[PDB]
Amino acid sequence: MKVGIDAGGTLIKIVQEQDNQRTFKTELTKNIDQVVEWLNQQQIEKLCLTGGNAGVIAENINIPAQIFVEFDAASQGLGILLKEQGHDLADYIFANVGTGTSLHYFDGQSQRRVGGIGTGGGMIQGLGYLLSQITDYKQLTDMAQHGDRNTIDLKVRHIYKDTEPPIPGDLTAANFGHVLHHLDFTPSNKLAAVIGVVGEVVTTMAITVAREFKTENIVYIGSSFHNNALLRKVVEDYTVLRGCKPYYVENGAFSGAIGALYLEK
Amino acid sequence: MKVGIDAGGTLIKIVQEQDNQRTFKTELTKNIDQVVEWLNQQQIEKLCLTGGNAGVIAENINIPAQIFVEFDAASQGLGILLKEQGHDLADYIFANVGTGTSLHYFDGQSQRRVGGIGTGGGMIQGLGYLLSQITDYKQLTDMAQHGDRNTIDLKVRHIYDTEPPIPGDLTAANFGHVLHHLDADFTPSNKLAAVIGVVGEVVTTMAITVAREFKTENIVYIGSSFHNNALLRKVVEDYTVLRGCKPYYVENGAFSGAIGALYLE
Numbered sequence: 049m050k051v052g053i054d055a056g057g058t059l060i061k062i063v064q065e066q067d068n069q070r071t072f073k074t075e076l077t078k079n080i081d082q083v084v085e086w087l088n089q090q091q092i093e094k095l096c097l098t099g100g101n102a103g104v105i106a107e108n109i110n111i112p113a114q115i116f117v118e119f120d121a122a123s124q125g126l127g128i129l130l131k132e133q134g135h136d137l138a139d140y141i142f143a144n145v146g147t148g149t150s151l152h153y154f155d156g157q158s159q160r161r162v163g164g165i166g167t168g169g170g171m172i173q174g175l176g177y178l179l180s181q182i183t184d185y186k187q188l189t190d191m192a193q194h195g196d197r198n199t200i201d202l203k204v205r206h207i208y209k210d211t212e213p214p215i216p217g218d219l220t221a222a223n224f225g226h227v228l229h230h231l232d233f234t235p236s237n238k239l240a241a242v243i244g245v246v247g248e249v250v251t252t253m254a255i256t257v258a259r260e261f262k263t264e265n266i267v268y269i270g271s272s273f274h275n276n277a278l279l280r281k282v283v284e285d286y287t288v289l290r291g292c293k294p295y296y297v298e299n300g301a302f303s304g305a306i307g308a309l310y311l312e313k
Numbered sequence: 314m315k316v317g318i319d320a321g322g323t324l325i326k327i328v329q330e331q332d333n334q335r336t337f338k339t340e341l342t343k344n345i346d347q348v349v350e351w352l353n354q355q356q357i358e359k360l361c362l363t364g365g366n367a368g369v370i371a372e373n374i375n376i377p378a379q380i381f382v383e384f385d386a387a388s389q390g391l392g393i394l395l396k397e398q399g400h401d402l403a404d405y406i407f408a409n410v411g412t413g414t415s416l417h418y419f420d421g422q423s424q425r426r427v428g429g430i431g432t433g434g435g436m437i438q439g440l441g442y443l444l445s446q447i448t449d450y451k452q453l454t455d456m457a458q459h460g461d462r463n464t465i466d467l468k469v470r471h472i473y474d475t476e477p478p479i480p481g482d483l484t485a486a487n488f489g490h491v492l493h494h495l496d497a498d499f500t501p502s503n504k505l506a507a508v509i510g511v512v513g514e515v516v517t518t519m520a521i522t523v524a525r526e527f528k529t530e531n532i533v534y535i536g537s538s539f540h541n542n543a544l545l546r547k548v549v550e551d552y553t554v555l556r557g558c559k560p561y562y563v564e565n566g567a568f569s570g571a572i573g574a575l576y577l578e
């Protein structure tokens with residue numbers, strides 16, 4: 049029984065490894081006390097930790113464990129998942145959309161963090177609550193899927209009216225830029241708008257560093273995508289529209305947890 | 314007299330050259346017909362137009378107008394103002410924070426658009442409205458200046474008693490602290506500071522990124538989004554300096570396109 053844990057800002061991602069068969073488990077970071085409780089009802093050969101709240105588990109537990117830096121673990125665990133699912137990428141950008149967003153360039157050998165931005169799942173939840181007073185994640189994201197962004201977001205065509213614009217008319221020109229023109233807004237529409245801006249910024253920054261480091265492959269991981277097809281859709285379609293190849297990975301959110309186990313030896 | 318006009322998504326910038334004197338004027342883009350009726354009264358030697366709404370002006374007036382693309386006009390005006398204000402820059406990014414944001418790299422001889430994002434002035438107004446119900450720009454910005462982002466934004470140190478792999482004071486996630494502070498009723502000022510906060514962080518991030526890519530330490534910020542918004546300017550200025558780049562703000566920078574259309578011929 050080997051256990052990899054990525055204790056991040058919002059979710060604790062738990063990977064158990066036993067007989068080459070891995071099981072996946074997730075807890076809220078708010079419930080970190082229940083993860084410690086659970087760990088001590090377990091027999092564990094090796095415990096491998098990563099992410100911001102790894103210290104909290106490390107100090108509150110009796111058994112020995114080892115801490116690894118999340119950027120390396122994510123990069124190592126991601127690489128493992130990609131290969132198992134049939135993707136042979138000599139290089140790629142990967143964007144880790146957790147509570148916040150961290151961007152890395154994997155050159156084929158190692159990773160380097162090339163950027164980051166505070167627009168992630170934290171903002172989806174945070175700004176989502178402020179606009180809808182919903183706290184429940186499933187409730188929030190499900191509702192957002194029905195949303196229409198037309199009355200909230202402003203497109204290039206809306207600025208350029210009938211004159212042909214210098215860049216595609218369909219692009220978002222300003223997020224939340226149509227609001228002051230439609231003053232006569234449902235939580236669906238508002239929540240979809242929040243997810244939309246988060247998506248478009250992440251994709252923008254991803255595509256920019258992808259171009260900077262001369263690769264067309266962009267991989268998107270993080271729990272921010274779970275139960276949120278709209279976010280996934282917003283990211284993939286713009287990646288494609290800029291001539292890059294988006295990649296999604298099953299259990300991609302557990303890259304840090306798996307990478308920790310791999311970094312351990 | 315001579316008249317240059319940048320008719321944008323939110324503001325119409327008007328530069329009047331008469332008797333060796335410049336007059337800088339702003340009218341709301343909702344009042345475009347009003348601007349049109351003013352142009353028809355006037356004695357004008359040369360009318361030069363740019364921006365998305367330039368076409369609405371041209372088809373409604375009774376004199377000829379020369380139309381140019383706002384990217385080329387913005388660049389020409391900015392290079393004029395820069396040289397006039399003592400600046401001798403070999404190369405730079407210029408970040409145009411208008412209704413939306415457009416990023417450009419000036420190599421010495423010409424500009425090329427290197428990216429954009431819909432986080433800008435129009436987001437500040439629309440999103441600000443949803444969180445406060447304030448539709449008056451001046452009320453919106455004034456209110457936001459005394460805002461405190463502490464209880465709303467999530468920093469890197471808050472995710473990590475551990476030493477983080479990147480500086481702890483940085484924003485990890487905008488609005489990422491909201492779920493932790495549910496009990497607090499969030500003041501309009503504090504919410505609006507965080508709106509301005511995320512807009513400033515995204516644009517500055519992208520401008521720093523493209524600056525690194527095109528190998529320039531100079532980033533010139535323009536656009537009327539900075540008008541009456543010390544917070545935005547500060548957010549953008551401090552983080553540009555934070556990342557080892559030189560930020561430049563230009564007197565009449567928001568009128569770059571209006572000036573530049575008069576000198577693009």
Ligand SMILES: CC(C)(COP(=O)(O)O)[C@@H](O)C(=O)NCCC(=O)NCCc1ccc2c(c1)OCO2
Pocket residue numbers: 056057058100145146147148149150151163164165166168469472482483484485486513514515517518552
């Ligand atoms: C911190 C962390 C690695 C933690 O991983 P996780 O818990 O999985 O989200 C991840 O959230 C992250 O990379 N967040 C974004 C950190 C970042 O690169 N911020 C730059 C955006 C920014 C731009 C301007 C800023 C600023 C911050 O602080 C003040 O001025």
Ligand SMILES: CC(C)(COP(=O)(O)O)[C@@H](O)C(=O)NCCC(=O)NCCc1ccc2c(c1)OCO2
Pocket residue numbers: 204207218219220221222248249251252286321322323365410411412413414415416428429430431
């Ligand atoms: C269009 C315009 C030049 C108009 O000038 P102005 O009125 O001076 O702000 C300016 O607002 C601008 O550059 N806006 C941003 C356009 C852009 O580069 N968008 C990319 C961000 C984006 C990312 C993903 C998207 C998307 C848009 O559309 C849906 O999918």
Ligand SMILES: Nc1ncnc2c1ncn2[C@@H]1O[C@H](COP(=O)(O)OP(=O)(O)O)[C@@H](O)[C@H]1O
Pocket residue numbers: 055056057058059060076099145146147148168169170171172173185269270271272273274301
């Ligand atoms: N069951 C859930 N509870 C809360 N947030 C969730 C859940 N499922 C997905 N999320 C989303 O995932 C985000 C966290 O993503 P993750 O990659 O786990 O980041 P971290 O490593 O910071 O925990 C949340 O902010 C939210 O947008």
Ligand SMILES: Nc1ncnc2c1ncn2[C@@H]1O[C@H](COP(=O)(O)OP(=O)(O)O)[C@@H](O)[C@H]1O
Pocket residue numbers: 320321322323324325410411412413433434435436437438450535536537538539540567
């Ligand atoms: N008088 C004003 N009324 C409304 N918004 C203003 C005003 N002055 C400055 N702004 C801000 O500047 C933005 C417009 O910037 P600008 O560069 O003029 O954009 P555009 O070229 O699209 O008109 C607005 O979205 C708003 O945030």
Ligand SMILES: [Mg+2]
Pocket residue numbers: 056057099146147
């Ligand atoms: Mg994480």
Ligand SMILES: [Mg+2]
Pocket residue numbers: 319321322364383411412570
């Ligand atoms: Mg403009």
